[PDB]
Amino acid sequence: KPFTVPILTVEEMSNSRFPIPLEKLYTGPSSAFVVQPQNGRCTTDGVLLGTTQLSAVNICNFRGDVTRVGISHDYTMNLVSQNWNNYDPTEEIPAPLGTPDFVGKIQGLLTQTTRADGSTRAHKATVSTGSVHFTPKLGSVQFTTDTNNDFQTGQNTKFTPVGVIQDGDHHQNEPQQWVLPNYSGTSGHNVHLAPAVAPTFPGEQLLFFRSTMPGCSGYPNMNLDCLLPQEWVSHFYQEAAPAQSDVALLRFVNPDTGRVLFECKLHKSGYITVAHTGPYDLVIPPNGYFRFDSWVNQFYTLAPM
Amino acid sequence: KPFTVPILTVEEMSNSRFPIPLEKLYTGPSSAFVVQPQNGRCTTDGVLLGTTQLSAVNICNFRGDVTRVGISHDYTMNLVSQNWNNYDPTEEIPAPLGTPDFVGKIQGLLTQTTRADGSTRAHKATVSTGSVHFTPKLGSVQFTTDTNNDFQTGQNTKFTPVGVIQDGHQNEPQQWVLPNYSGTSGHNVHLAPAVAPTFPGEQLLFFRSTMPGCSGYPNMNLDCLLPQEWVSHFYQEAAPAQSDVALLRFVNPDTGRVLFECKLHKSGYITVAHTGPYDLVIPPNGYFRFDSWVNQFYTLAPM
Ligand SMILES: C[C@@H]1O[C@@H](O[C@@H]2[C@@H](O[C@H]3O[C@H](CO)[C@H](O)[C@H](O)[C@H]3O)[C@@H](O)[C@@H](CO)O[C@@H]2O)[C@@H](O)[C@H](O)[C@@H]1O
Ligand SMILES: C[C@@H]1O[C@@H](O[C@@H]2[C@@H](O[C@H]3O[C@H](CO)[C@H](O)[C@H](O)[C@H]3O)[C@@H](O)[C@@H](CO)O[C@@H]2O)[C@@H](O)[C@H](O)[C@@H]1O
């Protein structure tokens, strides 16, 4: 089965690490980080990795029942699955599919319906994924909310993420997009992780699909880079085209002129490298798209960006 | 190019009318009312219709600058596009792509960044699409928010939708009543067509989600004609339609057994042979498979 990537333009696609559109292509140095995201991870032959699932609308969402922590404005959510069935901690994944894969304070609305009478409610809420109470692998996370009394026990509750917050004099100190949470808190180390990725070939860097997360309070670092658009994850999962070598050579083309703007290496394990050093917002026509041209190896020397 | 539909299961897909996952399949009568959604509209050969665009995460989102209405808690948003560029009201679409296509009060967060210093803010906010101030085709909508002073002028502002509210039970939203995209100033234009079965014994098949409820007693059902992933698939594939009707079989790969068959009409909606309201019962790995081009007079096996 011939391998292909989607023909959608960058801005027609979705970030695979938060439910927001892509904005641009970005390359930068990654030696200062361990780049090990768990969402947006999929092999070119369609094997999902980490905590990756198939739709952007589920990323960083949570569902379950809630109970108030003491007499505070915090609530513990006992997680269930996307379709409201019981969560299974025994599954060989790091955490429920779609769980946030960075340390940060994600703000959104926590909503609830009372089944018996159809009454509903919503409150602004934040989940701090660096908190010791962020234990999604164990089946629970904690939210700080704007209420201490309105949520009912035993009722279906959903968190819909919107953006991120920051607090402190050191501006843009959080979120930390390349620091994984401890999915089981202090109780144990992370398990079943998709591997870290790094360029190995001289002169190469990762290519990122970049968005700006909405900021909700303070001075957050709003950059969010994913390794694959969500639509590529879905495409590979469905097509399941066999990888005929370790690397798929892609050309980024202007469809109007037919000219190649740059070329890159899509590694079969699901990430892209380009030949560039330093931070660079790629200059591209908005109708540009990626095209698979041939199967190559990890030592293929790209035309420099 | 051979026509195909995605192999994703229902719960792996997204509603094309609000940024939430699909939950289930429903069929029912719809003779007594107009079915004319504007999001989730695409022909099988990839022509987008109505206000349909390509990703679910953009649906019912709004962007622009805001100005306070008087000294109230309401703010007017002067709309821009998904990437902060111009919206052209003269483009022959009903309203900006992704605009809500139902009358209801949508609640979410209105967020803002101050360009100069990177300070940010968020407030609970509702857009009433039945309001006279819901005029997206004119380039503006109005939000009621939980602040009367925190939003700044001339700064990028985004509404992220979460769910719906009600006042008065389940009388709103009205998912099949289109808002007036130009308010009282003009009638709706450039709409994707209304849809109905034409063959006796058939009903529409709906891809159903439940919108989160945020206050009161809202009607939370939300039915779309095509999953968002089908819109994106057809747009990219652009496979020619060999007839006006594609026969799909819904298959359980666990058994190879066909659960039911249905007609995917070229103009982008599905019918089944059934009379009455019915919540379909489907296996977890079930999916749709295109088998052949037929015609409007093909009789489906009863669903
Ligand atoms: C930088 C600052 O971020 C946000 O303000 C927060 C404060 O937020 C609280 O009050 C503000 C209005 O002053 C607003 O009503 C917000 O909803 C509410 O949570 C507060 O958290 C303090 C604590 O030190 O930090 C910031 O000042 C934002 O509202 C401001 O516009 C501004 O961007
Ligand atoms: C049916 C009812 O809907 C929601 O309540 C609203 C009220 O909402 C206001 O106060 C409530 C707490 O009582 C909550 O703090 C909410 O955020 C706030 O807007 C209010 O709008 C009244 C006015 O008619 O209608 C409802 O009572 C929800 O909060 C309740 O839990 C309940 O489901």
Side-chain angles (χ1 to χ4, degrees), chain A residues 1-255 257-258 260-305, chain B residues 1-256 258-296 298-303:
Chain A
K1 187 172 190 166
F3 179 69
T4 59
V5 300
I7 62 172
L8 301 172
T9 66
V10 173
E11 302 196 270
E12 286 172 346
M13 292 190 290
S14 310
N15 205 290
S16 55
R17 297 179 64 214
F18 204 77
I20 57 182
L22 297 180
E23 297 164 17
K24 62 185 144 181
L25 299 179
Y26 176 76
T27 184
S30 56
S31 59
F33 308 112
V34 177
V35 179
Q36 194 164 11
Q38 299 300 302
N39 288 315
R41 301 299 299 268
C42 185
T43 66
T44 57
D45 61 348
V47 182
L48 303 175
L49 310 172
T51 59
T52 297
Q53 51 73 58
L54 283 163
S55 178
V57 303
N58 303 311
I59 304 170
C60 294
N61 293 36
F62 303 82
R63 289 173 175 77
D65 62 274
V66 294
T67 64
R68 188 176 64 217
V69 179
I71 54 173
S72 78
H73 291 71
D74 274 35
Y75 285 78
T76 298
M77 180 180 282
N78 303 119
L79 300 176
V80 299
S81 70
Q82 179 192 303
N83 63 15
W84 301 100
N85 285 340
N86 293 357
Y87 162 64
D88 177 13
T90 78
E91 190 166 359
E92 296 185 343
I93 56 182
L97 305 185
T99 297
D101 67 356
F102 60 90
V103 174
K105 296 169 188 150
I106 300 167
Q107 184 160 105
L109 288 184
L110 195 61
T111 61
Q112 190 180 77
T113 296
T114 301
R115 177 73 58 99
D117 66 5
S119 58
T120 65
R121 58 203 62 89
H123 293 284
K124 197 164 80 180
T126 307
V127 54
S128 180
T129 67
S131 170
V132 302
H133 304 298
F134 186 75
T135 56
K137 178 62 173 181
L138 300 177
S140 71
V141 304
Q142 192 165 310
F143 295 93
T144 298
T145 82
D146 63 24
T147 190
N148 65 7
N149 212 38
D150 196 37
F151 287 116
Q152 294 164 25
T153 55
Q155 303 297 344
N156 284 353
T157 313
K158 184 186 178 187
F159 180 77
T160 299
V162 170
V164 293
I165 66 168
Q166 177 275 350
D167 192 25
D169 299 326
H170 295 138
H171 292 183
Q172 297 88 37
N173 64 333
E174 57 174 326
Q176 299 170 273
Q177 70 162 323
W178 300 126
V179 179
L180 288 175
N182 295 322
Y183 298 117
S184 295
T186 65
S187 72
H189 57 87
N190 287 343
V191 293
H192 300 302
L193 296 176
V197 303
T200 52
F201 192 74
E204 288 191 6
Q205 275 178 174
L206 294 167
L207 183 65
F208 300 104
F209 299 85
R210 177 165 274 202
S211 302
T212 309
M213 295 177 288
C216 295
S217 193
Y219 302 84
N221 183 345
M222 292 167 280
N223 294 327
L224 186 71
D225 293 309
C226 69
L227 303 179
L228 299 170
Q230 185 64 39
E231 290 80 0
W232 288 30
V233 173
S234 176
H235 186 76
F236 301 155
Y237 177 83
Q238 290 186 77
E239 288 287 297
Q244 303 191 30
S245 70
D246 293 331
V247 178
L249 180 65
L250 315 182
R251 273 57 184 271
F252 189 89
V253 177
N254 183 317
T257 66
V260 174
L261 284 16
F262 69 92
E263 58 177 24
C264 64
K265 287 157 68 177
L266 171 61
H267 300 262
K268 72 165 172 172
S269 63
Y271 67 97
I272 300 173
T273 56
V274 288
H276 195 66
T277 307
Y280 178 53
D281 283 336
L282 280 70
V283 185
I284 60 167
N287 58 340
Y289 73 106
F290 294 86
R291 186 188 67 205
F292 168 68
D293 284 351
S294 46
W295 288 108
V296 304
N297 73 30
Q298 69 173 299
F299 303 109
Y300 189 98
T301 306
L302 296 164
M305 184 164 282
Chain B
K1 181 188 293 189
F3 176 70
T4 61
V5 303
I7 62 173
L8 299 177
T9 66
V10 172
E11 291 170 26
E12 288 171 341
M13 292 189 289
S14 315
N15 202 294
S16 54
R17 296 179 63 211
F18 202 79
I20 56 180
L22 294 180
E23 299 168 10
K24 58 208 179 185
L25 301 176
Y26 170 80
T27 184
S30 59
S31 54
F33 53 92
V34 176
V35 177
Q36 191 157 29
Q38 298 300 305
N39 291 313
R41 301 297 302 266
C42 186
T43 68
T44 58
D45 59 349
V47 181
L48 304 174
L49 311 170
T51 56
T52 296
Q53 50 75 59
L54 287 165
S55 174
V57 302
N58 305 129
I59 304 168
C60 293
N61 291 38
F62 304 83
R63 288 172 177 80
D65 67 276
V66 293
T67 62
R68 188 177 55 205
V69 176
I71 61 177
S72 78
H73 291 74
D74 276 34
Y75 288 79
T76 296
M77 180 179 278
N78 300 299
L79 300 173
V80 296
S81 73
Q82 181 198 303
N83 65 6
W84 306 99
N85 293 121
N86 186 59
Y87 167 62
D88 184 354
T90 74
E91 186 179 3
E92 294 187 320
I93 53 177
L97 305 184
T99 300
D101 67 357
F102 57 90
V103 172
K105 299 164 188 158
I106 299 167
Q107 186 158 103
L109 288 184
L110 196 61
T111 61
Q112 191 178 77
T113 297
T114 301
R115 195 170 297 112
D117 64 5
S119 55
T120 66
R121 59 203 61 92
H123 294 282
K124 200 158 74 175
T126 306
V127 54
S128 181
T129 70
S131 172
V132 298
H133 306 299
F134 185 76
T135 54
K137 178 62 168 176
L138 289 174
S140 69
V141 301
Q142 191 165 313
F143 295 94
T144 298
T145 83
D146 65 23
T147 186
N148 63 10
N149 73 359
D150 197 36
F151 287 112
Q152 298 164 19
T153 56
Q155 304 298 336
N156 286 7
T157 312
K158 179 187 181 187
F159 181 78
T160 301
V162 172
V164 293
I165 67 168
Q166 177 269 1
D167 300 313
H169 289 180
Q170 296 89 34
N171 61 339
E172 57 171 331
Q174 303 170 274
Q175 72 160 324
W176 300 123
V177 179
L178 288 180
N180 289 321
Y181 297 116
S182 298
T184 64
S185 77
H187 55 277
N188 290 346
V189 287
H190 319 307
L191 299 183
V195 300
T198 29
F199 195 70
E202 290 185 13
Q203 288 178 169
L204 299 173
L205 183 67
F206 299 100
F207 297 87
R208 174 164 281 196
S209 304
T210 307
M211 293 181 290
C214 299
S215 195
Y217 301 81
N219 189 339
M220 295 168 279
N221 292 324
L222 186 70
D223 293 309
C224 66
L225 303 181
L226 298 171
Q228 188 62 37
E229 289 80 358
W230 289 29
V231 174
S232 63
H233 187 72
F234 302 154
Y235 176 82
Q236 292 182 77
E237 291 286 304
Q242 303 297 325
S243 79
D244 286 334
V245 182
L247 180 65
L248 313 183
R249 272 58 183 270
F250 189 90
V251 179
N252 183 354
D254 297 345
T255 66
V258 173
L259 188 65
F260 67 92
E261 55 179 19
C262 63
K263 285 176 174 165
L264 170 61
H265 301 265
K266 175 183 173 183
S267 61
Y269 64 91
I270 299 175
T271 57
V272 284
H274 189 77
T275 304
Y278 201 88
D279 285 290
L280 283 73
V281 181
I282 57 177
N285 296 321
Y287 73 100
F288 293 84
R289 183 188 69 202
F290 170 70
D291 285 351
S292 54
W293 293 102
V294 302
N295 70 38
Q296 67 183 103
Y298 190 89
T299 296
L300 294 165
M303 187 198 75

